[PDB]
Structure 1
């Protein structure tokens, strides 16, 4: 009765935070940020010193967490059907085919489950870009990234694993969401 659960959606996954209706939303923001900013509720910017009571929130209301660049972002759909969104631009020469890139990544399914993260093995992933050493959506989507950049790829099944799936948990005909952080070239 005195507590409320709030669903925070950042464009990759949904994470819930339960807090007392009189706890400042600062606690939710900090907890979210610590996991890895602009939070919106019904399109209005949440201030840290505001409580759920102040904003007339109800259980399981949704908060949008915006981790992208100040000024906003866009989701690009290319000729292949790949979608990508530059959350952070970074700076440097753009990644080109033939370069060996080192990244951190996290992947999620449509059902919201996280299926992998290179951060969970604490182990950067490196590959020759444009070599067919990764799924098609990665060969296309990592091209153009710059060091320090964070790009979110929404990969349709034809640019992923199609009707086969992979890794046990990626089912047939799955759209995949990856966040890729370019560490080095």
Structure 2
């Protein structure tokens, strides 16, 4: 009624959460799709807001211009759907990580919102 709430991990390691069911169409491979991305720290500190550009991030799914959690996340995400994709410190920035923005060892919380495909 009010909504669902569950967490599940994949074999790759990445994770994702349901925020808003999308009744449109799952992202296609080899095609460009516009979606909004939001980077949040372990505490909730925002370090990236696609909304800044005032437009959806249009990128080709399965091209190589994103991270594992991205390809896998969008691969399932549907138009108008919103899911919280959780990427580890290994499948994200990398062993180096950001100077002060993001720590070396920590879970990165990224929000994905499909606007169009």
Q: Which of the pair has the greater relative contact order for Cα pairs under 8 Å at 6+ separation?
A: 2
How many residue pairs end up in the alignment? 115
Unaligned segments of structure 1, at least 5 residues: 1-70
TM-score (norm 2): 0.86
| 8 A contact 1:94–1:145 mirrored in 2 | yes
Distance 1:77 1:177 in 2: 14
Instruction: Note the C-alpha offset of 1:121.
Output: 3.0
Runs of 4+ aligned structure 1 residues displaced above 4 Å come to none
Quote the offset at 1:171 in angstroms.
3.0
| Structure 1 vs Structure 2 CA RMSD | 1.8
Secondary structure at 1:157's aligned position in 2? coil
* Structure of greater Rg: 1
State the Cα deviation string for residues 67-117 of structure 1 (Å, max 9, x = none).
xxxx31211200011110121111122113212110112111113211010
Give unpaired runs (5+ residues) of structure 2: none
Match of 2:114 in 1: 182
Which residue of 24, 46, 53 maps to 1:114? Answer: 46
Q: Deviation of residue 180 (structure 1)?
A: 1.0
